[PDB]
């Protein structure tokens, strides 16, 4: 009764139509049965979309009506739902703030699909760069090994080059700074971001590391000091900005609010202190990965900014196929357990 | 009675890293508490001294207590192969909370994990019985030698342990 | 009267000693070990693999382990055993009907005895599936002693399947 993964690996022709356009409803279905596309097929998608990405600006400029998304973390089947909630991207302007890989075990699927959709709708669907779009983190986490189980080290590399073309940010409807992580002590004007060289593995310091890695203060909004940045002891790098730091950048830059993902929210989002000037939340966090890691029991959410109304859509987790840690196989998995219990039995049997 | 205070002198590759004490809640789960106490002293002949933390997952917890197989498959209580689940009165509220690792309900042996975060999805399934009284900073240090698959890069040992 | 033939790594002395433990385990002194006789040991009532071992020790399928079977089965773990022999034993923990092939149902059944209920059947089945797919290098929908060897060879678990 358990559906079984499809042995046939999609072809160029089955993926791309004669005009070169991705057949996303085809793709999407294969991927939900856990199927794969012939390596080249995938590598094409991965490279076609990165070219479009390398061409895009450090700071994108996206006009409402838009649907903003947070971390996706490989939870492919929670993505399929985020789309049923956020609306068909055939008729909707999107923006993912990053972190599509690692943590969940369908990270490549997410990637392939989101990459195929960037190709199909390059002027509507927008993807940014998240902390997890980089060699150093995908080596530690399961994406790399994932890629090698399902595909090859080549595909993994294809991706690594791609990720280097992910826009560092976005200026949405000229009112919001849409980033993954946060602000930089070194990034004071929207111009600064424009000057940064983004095509690289994020540095272990500086504005790009800070774009992707900064976090608001645990007591952001009610901090006991008007100090701006303090080193992030939580990430271990970048910084913890404050409510003042934000309102100073916001004002100087004539911006309304900052919209970022990066941190998990039980409600799948979080509005931070309201700007004294505006009465609108100075900072907004948005998490799109429901029941994170399968145990957080957290709700997911997208942000819909239309008709001058920022509407927070929440959704819950959906079902997805089991997978042992590090895509282990049941023999490697149980052999240690087996080789101990049998040892244990004989040992009690001989000490009779 | 009173709640016992044990300690662990952790060592990284032999090099001493520091000591970690724990307040055992016998006032709630006296049996489990004892089990950990007696294994800390060694007074039943077999114990934690010299054992390692085979599974350290950063931002999650430090799993140790396998003094027989040294990989997570073994270990035993002072009461035999294993003993029942006392109770789930206490819950995992955050860093420092000591609890028992197992292989299903009623399978407490000698394995335990020191939380480094709030792991609530474990409540009702694993037996919470103690907390780090001092040395949290040492536990945080052990986290660095961990990985997302638990495997460590330097052998984190329980060089010496006892009651305070 | 009538010598007993058997193939094993043990010398005459070891065959005698094991000959004594077999008599002690032989409750009804019938010359053959029964499961109830095996289960007479408390440490064994809490082991999900006892019946697998026993059916593996049971070469002539009569539901009992006579002395030849007991000795020769205890011999697979003889320190003197090679690598292959210890995988073979492992391979057998999975091949239930002893046709020399691990099947989709057999891999499921065995695993389930060990995992139990910390995995919905759906979950276990999926990973059993996915395990056979990547390991079925001949496409017969089942694992050969070779394919099995190709997946677990460098784990070196045979070094652990050793008793004295």
């Amino acid at each position: 009764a358990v559906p079984f993964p499809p042995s046939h690996r999609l072809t160029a022709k089955e993926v791309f139509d004669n005009d070169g356009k991705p057949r996303v409803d085809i793709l999407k279905a294969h991927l939900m049965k856990e199927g794969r596309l012939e390596e080249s097929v995938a590598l094409r998608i991965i490279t076609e979309g990165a070219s479009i990405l390398r061409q895009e600006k450090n700071l994108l400029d996206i006009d409402a009506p838009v649907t903003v998304c947070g971390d996706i973390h490989g939870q492919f089947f929670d993505l399929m739902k985020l789309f049923e909630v956020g609306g068909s991207p055939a008729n909707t302007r999107y923006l993912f703030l990053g972190d599509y890989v690692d943590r969940g075990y369908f990270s490549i699927e997410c990637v392939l699909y989101l990459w195929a959709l960037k190709i199909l709708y390059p002027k509507t669907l927008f993807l940014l760069r998240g902390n997890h779009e980089c060699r150093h983190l995908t080596e530690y986490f399961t994406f790399k090994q994932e890629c090698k189980i399902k595909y090859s080290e080549r595909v993994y590399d294809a991706c690594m080059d791609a990720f280097d073309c992910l826009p560092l940010a976005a200026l949405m409807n000229q009112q919001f700074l849409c980033v993954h992580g946060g602000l930089s002590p070194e990034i004071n004007t929207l111009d600064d971001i424009r000057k940064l060289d983004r095509f690289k593995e994020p540095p272990a310091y500086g504005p790009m590391c800070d774009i992707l890695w900064s976090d608001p203060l645990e007591d952001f909004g009610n901090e006991k000091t008007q100090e701006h940045f303090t080193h992030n002891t939580v990430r271990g790098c970048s910084y913890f900005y404050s409510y003042p730091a934000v309102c100073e950048f916001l004002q100087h830059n004539n911006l309304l609010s900052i919209l970022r993902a990066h941190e998990a929210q039980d409600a799948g989002y979080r509005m931070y202190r309201k700007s004294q000037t505006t009465g609108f939340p100075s900072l907004i966090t948005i998490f799109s990965a429901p029941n994170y890691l399968d145990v957080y029991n957290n709700k997911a959410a997208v942000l819909k900014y239309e008709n001058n109304v920022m509407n927070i859509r929440q959704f819950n987790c959906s079902p997805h196929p089991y997978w042992l840690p590090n895509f282990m196989d049941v023999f490697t998995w149980s052999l240690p357990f087996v080789g101990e219990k049998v040892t244990e039995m004989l040992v009690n049997v001989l000490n009779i | 009675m009173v709640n016992p205070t044990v300690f662990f002198d952790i060592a990284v590759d032999g090099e001493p890293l520091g000591r970690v004490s724990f307040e055992l809640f016998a006032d709630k789960v006296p049996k489990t508490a004892e089990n950990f106490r007696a294994l800390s002293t060694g007074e039943k002949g077999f114990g934690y001294k010299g054992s390692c933390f085979h599974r350290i997952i950063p931002g999650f917890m430090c799993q140790g207590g396998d003094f027989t197989r040294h990989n997570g498959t073994g270990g035993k209580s002072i009461y035999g192969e294993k003993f029942e689940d006392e109770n789930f009165i206490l819950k995992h509220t955050g860093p420092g909370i000591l609890s028992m690792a197992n292989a299903g309900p009623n399978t407490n042996g000698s394995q335990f994990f020191i939380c480094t975060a709030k792991t609530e999805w474990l409540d009702g399934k694993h037996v919470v019985f103690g907390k780090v009284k001092e040395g949290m900073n040492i536990v945080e240090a052990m986290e660095r030698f961990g990985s997302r698959n638990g495997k460590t890069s330097k052998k984190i040992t329980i060089a010496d342990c006892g009651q305070l | 009267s009538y010598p007993l033939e058997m193939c094993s790594h043990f010398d005459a002395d070891e065959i005698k000693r094991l000959g004594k433990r077999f008599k002690k385990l032989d409750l009804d002194n019938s010359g053959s070990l029964s499961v109830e006789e095996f289960m007479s040991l408390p440490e064994l009532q809490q082991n999900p693999l006892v019946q697998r071992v026993i059916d593996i020790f049971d070469t002539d399928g009569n539901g009992e382990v006579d002395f030849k079977e007991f000795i020769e089965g205890v011999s697979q773990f003889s320190v003197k055993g090679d690598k292959e022999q210890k995988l073979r034993f492992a391979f057998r923990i999975y091949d239930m009907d002893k046709d020399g092939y691990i099947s989709n149902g057999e891999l499921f059944q065995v695993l389930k005895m060990m995992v139990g209920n910390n995995l919905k059947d759906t979950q276990l089945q999926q990973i059993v599936d996915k395990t056979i797919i990547n390991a079925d290098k001949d496409g017969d929908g089942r694992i050969s002693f070779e394919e099995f060897c190709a997946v677990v060879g460098g784990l070196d678990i045979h070094k652990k399947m050793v008793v004295d």
Partner: peptide, 11 residues
């Protein structure tokens, strides 16, 4: 996922 077992580590 994030579980603490002794024998059959799960996701």
């Amino acid at each position: 996922x994030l579980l603490v077992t002794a024998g059959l580590v799960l996701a």
